[PDB]
Amino acid sequence: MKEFYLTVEQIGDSIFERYIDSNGRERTREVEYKPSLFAHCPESQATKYFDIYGKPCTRKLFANMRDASQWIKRMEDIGLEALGMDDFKLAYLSDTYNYEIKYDHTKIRVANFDIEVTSPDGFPEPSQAKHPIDAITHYDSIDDRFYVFDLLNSPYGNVEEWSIEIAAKLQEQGGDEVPSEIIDKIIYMPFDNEKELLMEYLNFWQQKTPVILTGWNVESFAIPYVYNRIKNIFGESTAKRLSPHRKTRVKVIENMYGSREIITLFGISVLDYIDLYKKFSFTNQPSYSLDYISEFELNVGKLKYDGPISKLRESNHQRYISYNIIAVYRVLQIDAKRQFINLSLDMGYYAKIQIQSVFSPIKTWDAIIFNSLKEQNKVIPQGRSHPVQPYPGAFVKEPIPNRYKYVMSFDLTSLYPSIIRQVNISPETIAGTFKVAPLHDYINAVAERPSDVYSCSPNGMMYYKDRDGVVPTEITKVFNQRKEHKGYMLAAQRNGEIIKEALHNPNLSVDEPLDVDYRFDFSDEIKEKIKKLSAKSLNEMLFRAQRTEVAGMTAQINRKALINGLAGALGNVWFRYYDLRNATAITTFGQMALQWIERKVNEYLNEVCGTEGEAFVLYGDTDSIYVSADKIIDKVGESKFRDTNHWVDFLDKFARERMEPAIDRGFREMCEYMNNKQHLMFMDREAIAGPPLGSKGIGGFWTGKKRYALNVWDMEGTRYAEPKLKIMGLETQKSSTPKAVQKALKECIRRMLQEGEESLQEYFKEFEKEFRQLNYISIASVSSANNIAKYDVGGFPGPKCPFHIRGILTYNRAIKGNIDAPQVVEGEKVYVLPLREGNPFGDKCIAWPSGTEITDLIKDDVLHWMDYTVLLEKTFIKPLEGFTSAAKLDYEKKASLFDMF
DNA sequence: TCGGTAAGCAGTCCGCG
DNA sequence: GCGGACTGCTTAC
Ligand SMILES: Cc1cn([C@H]2C[C@H](O)[C@@H](COP(=O)(O)OP(=O)(O)OP(=O)(O)O)O2)c(=O)[nH]c1=O
Ligand SMILES: [Ca+2]
Ligand SMILES: [Ca+2]
Ligand SMILES: [Ca+2]
Ligand SMILES: [Ca+2]
Ligand SMILES: [Ca+2]
Ligand SMILES: [Ca+2]
Ligand SMILES: [Ca+2]
């Protein structure tokens, strides 16, 4: 097999690399890598090296990496550009793996771990590590085993061994319900004392050294805790054994409000799963507890235990250990579903970076572009300092707030990367500038043609047309990967709908789910077999189709994110190729494209309808348009349609056979106007929306920019078994909105769009009557909580104190003098409830850590004093008033002359 | 929250005769 | 009461 790296580090004048050799073995080597950098040279000097602008460069070979770094400094002192890859480990990887890397995940040691630490005096701070580590569960992907290290004797209590037999039993048998499928994979090791536990853990770590290290909050908690605890007990040298090269560094992570410390383990790639999840999941959750996320992702119930976690080991060590094991497994289950580790390996190996660098698109693109240019003996420019400067982005049309009955939407494929490719936007393809007219003049095609030679953007920029720039070349490669995975995602989605349809008529039989590849549209044969399957088999197939859809979604949306990241990286001062000329060329072209096609679509539809100045495009945001289809439907007449699906088919056909060709013609003209390199503005139909045929549903409504709801029957070619609400921006979509309130508002919207005013009024009346019975957590608001300290004046709200911060301050007074009470953590999320006048808490609201029950110390008083009237008005009525006024509907029945009867 | 812009709503403070 | 200036937070793209 072809070799591939696992990890790489620079330590002084050495590269330390762990890798898989040609025989599939893990090896480590130390290499005295001599790096090269570049200076510009006279044209009279023969060279094969040229900078991206075609200027000749001489290669400087250094005796060692320190010399190269010192040279960079002296070049700054002189005032001359020092060209080339200054991150020498990336240059090392580029030289050592000068081919497309094919990696074998089965040879990569991926470790998932979690620790337990009993703490009687509050949160056990990892920088202090003053409490014993009393459990570690460490799963190894190569062994496929959960290694459990269990401390039996501690100053906080001596306990009996954990029982695998009790662990396996149902919770109804008094067991812990450790999943049967991992029971045979547990290797249990009890310890007489913590020193022996940790010494054996380190020996184990030496034998089975993680390449990828993950878990939940491992970077912020588990790793620094283990490191600092071992340091405290044994000294620094022993703690550094967590690194295969015995090198660690405290790294200070800074944000706007303060800083925190993590431990960098040289020769390990830490991918904390909480951070993978935050980056790659495209959710915003009210809590990031593993409990909360596991329930969301897997539909597994909360891990139940009595009393505080600080007393769990002494009261129920059996459950304590089982829950530690289950916690590690839950992350594995989340990854089996989401496949973020797979994604990270794919992207990291593609770019030729340390795997942990996938968190940074700037670093990822720096490496991709460097490797690409190096192939042509081209030389990358030096990174430079730039002041942060604001620049313009997308256009968003102001909609007329209203109901909108029939709506077809259209959206441009991968807009920003497609603009880069079409215009040929790259650092080295800049050709010059032209004199700009107001944007409106380009939109209406009255401005003079910018250039007859170069490819243009309406920001004034001109680009070469003779050859693709490196940015277009490389962005295209990742776009093509994205397109492939999106194809799989949509097939799995369509396949899912086939199965949902079949589930209307399940067969009474005992059978098996079909062995099929859900990434490809089901054949006629598979379809016929599905129609004969039991509900059991169909539901299993549906689960599998949905899992395939999720895998496709991960792979496509994050490749989309990567390529979009390149567009914005051009506007990030830390990117080697930062250039606001290029960043603005993208965004300004985007504004033009949207408003240009708005004009073209209005002109086309006024022509088909035989009208003048009528606005068919009701809304657009960045690269989408929403078209009112009422007039199209009315031209055949609602009474001609057999059912909802009939008019959906009709609009689908109209969009594909009439509108898309018109749109294409409009964009081809725009391409010629800007003299672009290649026409790549592909705007395809997205949604078909409307009320069910014969209903009083309103179909859709807008309240303003980025705030709308549509009843969708078909989305990008997926014809739904049941209509799906597409709601954007409204409170149903906001993590700050109480859970039960999101649910209620969604049902109000569903009724509005599908059933009509009377249905809405019926539901509103019921919700208003019954909502006080809702669990307090389900009706609590949610907010991130920053700068608690800033607004804290002696335990009380300072000037301009935000509402949620006031709530935290109230909580802090109510729990004062309790080291055991859960503390609100700066920067994390809280639940927030309003409090009635005259409550014992002395203020109008209270807040506590999100994803948790409020401490029993104050729970009953919170429940007693919760202000239901305020909560309802703020989170439910006010947003509903907004929806209904926009939709020109009433949520309460108005008096009429009929009431006299 | 270590890892591009546009733009909405909650809430504080305070004006608005 | 509502709206502007401002802070804070959140989502759409
Ligand atoms: C969603 C999203 C969009 N954008 C920018 C870049 C996108 O090209 C542009 C339009 O957004 P989108 O229409 O959401 O995405 P897209 O056009 O890139 O891809 P798709 O084929 O799925 O429609 O907005 C971001 O910068 N970050 C983001 O997270
Ligand atoms: Ca735990
Ligand atoms: Ca798009
Ligand atoms: Ca059937
Ligand atoms: Ca879009
Ligand atoms: Ca098309
Ligand atoms: Ca203070
Ligand atoms: Ca206001």
Side-chain angles (χ1 to χ4, degrees):
Chain A
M1 42 152 287
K2 278 286 198 79
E3 305 172 47
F4 63 98
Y5 67 93
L6 294 165
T7 65
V8 67
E9 303 285 0
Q10 181 189 340
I11 302 167
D13 290 328
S14 283
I15 292 290
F16 283 85
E17 187 200 3
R18 296 171 68 196
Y19 68 105
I20 298 295
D21 74 11
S22 56
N23 290 320
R25 273 101 172 247
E26 183 178 327
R27 305 277 288 284
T28 311
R29 61 183 162 205
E30 181 187 349
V31 180
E32 312 179 77
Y33 179 64
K34 293 186 182 174
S36 291
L37 298 162
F38 300 81
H40 288 120
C41 64
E43 296 168 333
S44 62
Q45 192 165 185
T47 183
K48 71 181 188 192
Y49 309 103
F50 295 85
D51 79 8
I52 63 170
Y53 308 106
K55 313 228 85 177
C57 291
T58 191
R59 186 162 66 89
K60 317 272 283 175
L61 198 247
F62 298 92
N64 50 64
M65 289 182 280
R66 258 77 157 275
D67 280 356
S69 279
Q70 286 305 114
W71 182 77
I72 292 175
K73 286 171 184 279
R74 285 191 305 265
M75 291 290 281
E76 188 189 330
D77 293 341
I78 297 161
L80 291 169
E81 191 180 1
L83 296 92
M85 177 47 73
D86 57 310
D87 189 350
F88 307 126
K89 58 203 174 297
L90 296 184
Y92 172 85
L93 289 182
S94 185
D95 283 332
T96 307
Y97 302 93
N98 191 25
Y99 48 85
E100 176 171 45
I101 291 164
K102 214 88 274 175
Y103 71 95
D104 179 353
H105 77 92
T106 72
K107 311 290 200 171
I108 303 178
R109 198 175 300 273
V110 181
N112 280 68
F113 85 123
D114 189 67
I115 76 174
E116 302 299 338
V117 173
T118 295
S119 177
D121 55 20
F123 181 82
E125 288 301 334
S127 66
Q128 309 296 131
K130 62 175 182 183
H131 305 106
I133 293 165
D134 56 30
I136 308 167
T137 296
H138 179 123
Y139 174 84
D140 183 284
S141 72
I142 290 174
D143 296 344
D144 189 30
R145 294 293 181 271
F146 297 79
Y147 292 91
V148 183
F149 301 76
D150 180 12
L151 181 62
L152 303 185
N153 300 294
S154 161
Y156 306 138
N158 296 335
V159 296
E160 299 304 325
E161 281 187 25
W162 169 83
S163 165
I164 198 158
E165 294 87 8
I166 291 166
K169 284 186 173 187
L170 299 170
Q171 302 233 326
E172 298 88 355
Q173 282 177 286
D176 307 311
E177 272 170 39
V178 174
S180 55
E181 73 270 11
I182 70 167
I183 287 292
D184 289 352
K185 301 189 189 193
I186 296 162
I187 296 171
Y188 175 70
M189 298 160 286
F191 294 91
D192 180 273
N193 64 85
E194 189 196 4
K195 282 170 183 153
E196 280 175 39
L197 177 334
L198 292 165
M199 288 185 293
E200 182 50 47
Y201 188 63
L202 284 172
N203 285 157
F204 158 87
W205 188 282
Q206 313 222 138
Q207 288 302 315
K208 300 168 196 298
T209 309
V211 171
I212 307 301
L213 185 58
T214 189
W216 201 259
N217 285 310
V218 294
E219 196 183 62
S220 62
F221 183 75
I223 295 161
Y225 203 99
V226 176
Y227 181 86
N228 286 315
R229 185 69 186 169
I230 291 166
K231 190 163 96 86
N232 285 351
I233 296 166
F234 299 101
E236 270 194 307
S237 72
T238 300
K240 289 172 184 187
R241 293 175 51 206
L242 292 170
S243 163
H245 317 304
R246 311 302 185 250
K247 181 149 162 54
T248 69
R249 194 176 292 177
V250 175
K251 188 186 180 173
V252 182
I253 303 304
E254 301 187 332
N255 65 41
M256 206 154 60
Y257 326 100
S259 70
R260 59 188 183 91
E261 294 182 349
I262 66 171
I263 309 299
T264 299
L265 304 174
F266 279 65
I268 310 267
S269 286
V270 174
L271 305 174
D272 191 336
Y273 216 92
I274 191 170
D275 295 323
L276 294 176
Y277 190 89
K278 287 174 175 170
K279 179 182 172 59
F280 293 137
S281 77
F282 293 87
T283 61
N284 190 19
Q285 302 286 14
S287 166
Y288 287 89
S289 75
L290 182 52
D291 260 353
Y292 197 91
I293 301 298
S294 292
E295 198 258 34
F296 180 91
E297 293 293 322
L298 306 174
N299 292 292
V300 291
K302 176 169 80 177
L303 290 176
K304 277 91 53 53
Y305 59 91
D306 292 342
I309 218 276
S310 68
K311 292 174 176 179
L312 187 56
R313 181 181 169 273
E314 77 170 336
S315 63
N316 204 336
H317 173 255
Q318 175 63 39
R319 180 143 295 184
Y320 189 78
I321 297 305
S322 282
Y323 282 7
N324 178 235
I325 299 162
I326 291 163
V328 172
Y329 187 43
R330 274 172 182 198
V331 180
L332 296 167
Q333 292 181 106
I334 294 163
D335 193 58
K337 177 184 182 192
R338 290 291 198 148
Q339 301 177 195
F340 298 150
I341 301 288
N342 180 72
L343 177 65
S344 302
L345 295 172
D346 275 0
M347 295 199 298
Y349 283 121
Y350 182 83
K352 295 177 178 157
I353 55 179
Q354 299 188 124
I355 305 304
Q356 65 265 36
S357 285
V358 302
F359 284 110
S360 171
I362 287 163
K363 190 67 163 183
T364 304
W365 284 111
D366 198 39
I368 292 171
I369 295 164
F370 156 63
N371 277 280
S372 180
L373 295 169
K374 177 165 156 288
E375 280 299 293
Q376 276 94 239
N377 295 325
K378 291 170 175 192
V379 179
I380 71 176
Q382 187 174 22
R384 280 164 141 85
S385 182
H386 315 272
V388 174
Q389 283 184 284
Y391 70 94
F395 174 80
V396 185
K397 182 185 173 67
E398 188 76 63
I400 300 170
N402 208 345
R403 62 179 75 179
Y404 291 92
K405 190 171 178 189
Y406 295 102
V407 175
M408 290 176 297
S409 67
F410 299 80
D411 157 83
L412 282 150
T413 301
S414 285
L415 184 65
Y416 283 11
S418 296
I419 292 172
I420 284 166
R421 293 168 60 211
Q422 161 151 345
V423 184
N424 198 30
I425 298 164
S426 207
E428 84 285 21
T429 53
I430 294 166
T433 58
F434 64 93
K435 197 154 68 174
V436 305
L439 186 74
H440 175 265
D441 290 349
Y442 298 109
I443 294 162
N444 293 314
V446 293
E448 63 179 346
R449 192 152 180 266
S451 180
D452 282 323
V453 181
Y454 301 117
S455 169
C456 301
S457 169
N459 79 323
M461 290 297 291
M462 309 199 295
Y463 301 89
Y464 302 143
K465 301 190 68 179
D466 64 310
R467 58 178 206 273
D468 282 333
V470 61
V471 161
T473 294
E474 293 306 317
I475 210 170
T476 297
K477 292 176 188 173
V478 180
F479 169 73
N480 287 335
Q481 302 178 348
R482 185 270 173 138
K483 186 183 176 184
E484 177 188 351
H485 292 285
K486 185 169 175 182
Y488 302 148
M489 185 196 71
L490 292 176
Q493 194 178 89
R494 296 183 296 264
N495 285 338
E497 295 307 307
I498 290 168
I499 297 158
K500 293 179 191 176
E501 297 277 8
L503 274 159
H504 298 322
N505 295 105
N507 294 60
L508 291 168
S509 61
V510 182
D511 51 29
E512 288 294 295
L514 268 35
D515 191 18
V516 293
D517 188 344
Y518 296 91
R519 299 176 303 162
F520 298 96
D521 287 291
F522 291 156
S523 68
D524 296 345
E525 175 162 45
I526 290 164
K527 280 177 184 165
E528 292 302 297
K529 289 176 183 173
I530 278 166
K531 289 182 180 191
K532 292 173 184 182
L533 289 176
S534 72
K536 184 177 154 72
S537 290
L538 288 169
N539 281 128
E540 184 52 42
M541 291 188 70
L542 183 54
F543 177 84
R544 294 174 187 187
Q546 290 173 156
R547 282 299 177 90
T548 302
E549 189 188 341
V550 173
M553 173 63 93
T554 290
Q556 76 86 17
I557 204 172
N558 291 296
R559 281 171 178 83
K560 165 181 171 174
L562 184 58
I563 56 177
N564 289 348
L566 182 51
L570 294 165
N572 181 305
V573 299
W574 302 108
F575 189 46
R576 191 179 301 271
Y577 310 99
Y578 172 82
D579 196 331
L580 291 191
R581 298 173 297 173
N582 288 342
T584 313
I586 296 162
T587 66
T588 309
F589 189 99
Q591 293 212 10
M592 180 187 60
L594 181 54
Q595 299 173 87
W596 176 280
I597 213 73
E598 172 184 20
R599 178 177 59 83
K600 287 291 193 178
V601 166
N602 281 335
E603 285 174 3
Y604 179 69
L605 291 170
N606 271 293
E607 189 186 61
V608 314
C609 294
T611 49
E612 269 307 310
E614 312 283 22
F616 288 86
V617 175
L618 66 107
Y619 184 65
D621 182 336
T622 307
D623 71 332
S624 70
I625 57 166
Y626 288 80
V627 185
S628 176
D630 291 15
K631 281 168 170 60
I632 308 300
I633 291 292
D634 287 355
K635 278 181 187 302
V636 342
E638 272 171 335
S639 71
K640 270 81 162 203
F641 298 110
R642 282 174 291 104
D643 46 33
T644 301
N645 204 58
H646 193 190
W647 69 255
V648 177
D649 277 345
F650 167 76
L651 291 185
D652 170 60
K653 190 183 182 184
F654 187 85
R656 183 186 53 256
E657 299 186 349
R658 302 291 161 199
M659 285 180 79
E660 285 182 4
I663 290 167
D664 294 336
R665 287 191 301 273
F667 278 128
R668 287 190 180 273
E669 186 178 288
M670 194 184 86
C671 186
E672 194 163 6
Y673 189 29
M674 292 294 109
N675 195 30
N676 297 137
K677 193 162 185 302
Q678 179 181 11
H679 162 59
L680 289 168
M681 292 300 96
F682 305 145
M683 171 173 255
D684 294 336
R685 191 270 290 171
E686 183 154 278
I688 300 175
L693 222 215
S695 73
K696 295 177 185 175
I698 66 166
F701 66 88
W702 265 255
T703 75
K705 297 188 185 177
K706 294 179 193 287
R707 288 183 61 89
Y708 62 93
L710 295 169
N711 192 52
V712 180
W713 304 89
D714 195 290
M715 183 68 161
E716 280 198 279
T718 296
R719 187 70 57 89
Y720 298 125
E722 296 292 336
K724 189 111 94 75
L725 303 184
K726 178 187 178 55
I727 303 165
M728 314 303 316
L730 309 187
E731 280 77 2
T732 52
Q733 310 310 114
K734 295 182 78 161
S735 66
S736 44
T737 296
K739 267 283 155 69
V741 174
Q742 294 174 329
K743 184 181 172 56
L745 287 170
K746 186 170 186 178
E747 178 60 10
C748 285
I749 292 165
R750 189 199 66 79
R751 291 174 172 250
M752 284 166 76
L753 308 194
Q754 296 183 350
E755 295 173 10
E757 189 178 47
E758 179 166 14
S759 180
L760 189 247
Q761 292 168 177
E762 284 189 31
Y763 194 74
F764 174 84
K765 195 190 289 173
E766 208 59 66
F767 190 76
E768 182 179 56
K769 191 141 48 185
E770 315 290 349
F771 82 101
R772 292 174 173 253
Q773 305 149 215
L774 288 160
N775 182 263
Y776 77 112
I777 289 168
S778 79
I779 53 176
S781 295
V782 178
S783 185
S784 292
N786 304 298
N787 277 299
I788 303 164
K790 184 215 267 193
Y791 292 105
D792 186 337
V793 189
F796 290 94
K800 299 156 192 169
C801 184
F803 191 82
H804 59 293
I805 305 298
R806 177 182 294 273
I808 289 164
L809 294 176
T810 307
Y811 175 81
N812 287 356
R813 294 195 302 279
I815 70 162
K816 198 165 87 76
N818 275 252
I819 40 92
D820 60 285
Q823 298 293 130
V824 172
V825 183
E826 167 77 18
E828 308 268 65
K829 297 185 175 193
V830 290
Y831 289 130
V832 187
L833 282 175
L835 265 15
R836 291 195 318 274
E837 204 185 56
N839 73 84
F841 294 103
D843 220 324
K844 59 171 176 185
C845 62
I846 193 166
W848 72 100
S850 73
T852 73
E853 290 278 343
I854 199 167
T855 176
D856 282 334
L857 299 167
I858 56 170
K859 182 178 176 181
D860 294 334
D861 293 308
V862 172
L863 292 179
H864 186 267
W865 289 97
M866 281 175 76
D867 194 330
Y868 290 103
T869 303
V870 165
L871 173 160
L872 187 70
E873 194 70 35
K874 274 156 49 158
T875 67
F876 186 72
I877 302 177
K878 203 164 162 193
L880 187 63
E881 167 65 22
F883 305 165
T884 58
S885 60
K888 306 194 189 305
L889 241 21
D890 295 313
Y891 61 92
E892 287 181 311
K893 192 177 177 168
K894 45 149 184 162
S896 75
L897 261 58
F898 251 69
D899 302 342
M900 287 185 173
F901 288 85

